[PDB]
Design a protein around this ligand. Structure first.
Ligand SMILES: [Mg+2]
Ligand SMILES: [Mg+2]
Ligand SMILES: [Mg+2]
Ligand SMILES: [Mg+2]
Lengths: 325, 327
């Protein structure tokens, strides 16, 4: 069925005579941007007219060339087809650059999220692939293989970012084979990573702050850090940059729990990473929230001291969880 | 290539045919490729019933990878009838071969290496600088050995592949590099565990980073980034001078910067590491302080206090930028 559906997506794209609007999810990541650019370039080499509305984050701005990605679409072009990647088309609120609730043309979808409703004129959803870019590569082969370096490179970038440079346990042998194909097509791995290593002054100044509120507590097995808007003002950064430090704190030794705490002032908004025989969703269901399986995310509308005490009690609760299991 | 496959075959042949002990060696201060290649070949050779000694000193950050008592201390003499299997280094470069003294040995030597400077002289050998990790080539040798594959063999070879390619990020990564990773992963290489263990940072790392970042400085409008580390900072952090080595690179990553400078202040002298981009020559700046190097990567040791040294480094920086802009 994977093969048959990759084929149906590609056939629908090949058969479409009008413009093709290529879309991904709001706040696009490397997989989103990379899948949209790879598919867009492949379709343009075949002579398709493509619109790709997307707001490029700065750390990814080296990749698009002028006029490849546009501002959000005012209105849908006549005879358009929508190719939605790395997100569910049945979730318009999460699809950025065009409003799918105002469109009635054919819709095609390529996604690797298990939450997908699996409803489109032609679609392929495969949670066992760790990046939509892998799936888009298979579509491009099914389109007639319009390969070039310009197509391969953005797809390799999305393979990279969605697997954390081939570090996550989602990486299968098939993931590596796809990277081998992409490299043979010309993907510029060295250039990609020289570009992805660049960091703004904001990053360093904010990481000086983030580390300023760091403590190795619980006798040595839990780490905790904290960020306020003054710290953001002194670093010259934004709140969407604090989401690059909880990963580094999970990496601490002799520890089990790495807690980030965003302190807007009138509420605390947590990100609680962990590792080992400790779960971080038995603290996100012990003070409320949502997420994925090992992740977390809980908002306490109190001030700073109180929310942290609530969190510490929930952590001793996961501690009894460990003492029991 | 037939040459490559013939030499892989000759190396496996010499290993299978040898009746006595096989001493498996790599270079001093082993990296992930050295340890991972030594462990993969040693484990494979043991499933074929061979007597293997693997003398190696493992650095702390890699000590998760060997089984306890899998490696030995350096050999103070050679077992009778031994063969030396030298990986990830040239056997004609004995100073760099750690764990045994190859100038005292004249039994059979086998070599598996991927550096171009290798003299290519061994009783059986294969050198291929187009392979980005010796662990790739060791995997090919294990195929030619006929040894049973398993997670124990595949996992250490996967680490060497990771560490020598920078997690598949260097320009040396080829299609066949990824084809090798796929094959290792299919054999059970524990990719998640490996990257967990490689990102296990002691408290010292974070404290030292805070201190280093505490002295970070952006100068000349972002073009120049600069910091330093002294003994007080290492005392406060519980850190070593060794841990001050991944910092000149994290600084070169600063956007808009054409020059990164790290200064190590030992009380009586200051060692400067300089990296530059675009038109800025780190060499000219280093030569002005008494040092030198390549155009984008240079160094100098000034025998003074940090204050005196910094003033002279600022002066040398101003001249270089002034030359660049006047061009
Ligand atoms: Mg995404
Ligand atoms: Mg994705
Ligand atoms: Mg090496
Ligand atoms: Mg090597």
């Amino acid at each position: 069925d994977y093969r048959r559906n990759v084929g149906a997506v590609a056939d629908a794209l090949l058969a479409h005579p009008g413009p093709i609007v290529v879309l991904s999810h709001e706040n696009p990541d490397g997989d989103a941007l990379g899948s949209v650019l790879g598919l867009s370039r492949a379709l343009r080499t075949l002579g398709k007219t493509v619109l790709a509305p997307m707001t490029v984050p700065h750390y990814l701005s080296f990749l698009p060339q002028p006029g490849e990605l546009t501002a959000p679409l005012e209105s849908w072009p006549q005879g358009a087809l929508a190719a939605v990647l790395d997100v569910d088309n049945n979730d318009p609120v999460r699809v950025a650059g065009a409003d799918l609730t105002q469109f009635d043309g054919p819709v095609v979808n390529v996604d690797h999220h298990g939450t997908n409703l699996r409803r489109a004129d032609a679609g392929v959803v495969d949670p066992s692939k760790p990046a939509a870019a892998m799936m888009v590569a298979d579509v491009i082969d099914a389109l007639g293989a319009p390969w070039s370096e310009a197509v391969a490179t953005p797809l390799m970038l999305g393979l990279n970012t969605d697997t954390g440079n081939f570090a996550f346990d989602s990486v299968s042998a098939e993931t590596f084979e796809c990277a081998a194909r992409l490299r043979a097509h010309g993907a510029r791995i060295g250039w990609l990573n020289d570009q992805m290593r660049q960091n703004p002054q904001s990053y360093y100044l904010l990481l000086r702050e983030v580390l300023g509120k760091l403590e190795f507590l619980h006798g040595g097995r839990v780490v905790q850090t904290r960020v306020d808007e003054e710290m953001l003002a002194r670093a010259g950064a934004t709140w969407e940059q604090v989401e690059n430090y909880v990963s580094m704190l999970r990496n601490a030794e002799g520890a089990q729990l790495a807690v980030m705490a965003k302190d807007y002032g009138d509420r605390v908004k947590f990100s609680l990473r962990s590792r080992g025989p400790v779960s971080a969703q038995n603290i996100a269901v012990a003070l409320g929230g949502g997420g994925h399986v090992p992740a977390a995310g809980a908002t306490v509308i109190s001030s700073y001291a109180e929310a942290r005490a609530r969190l510490d009690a929930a952590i001793e609760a996961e501690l009894a969880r460990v003492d029991a299991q």
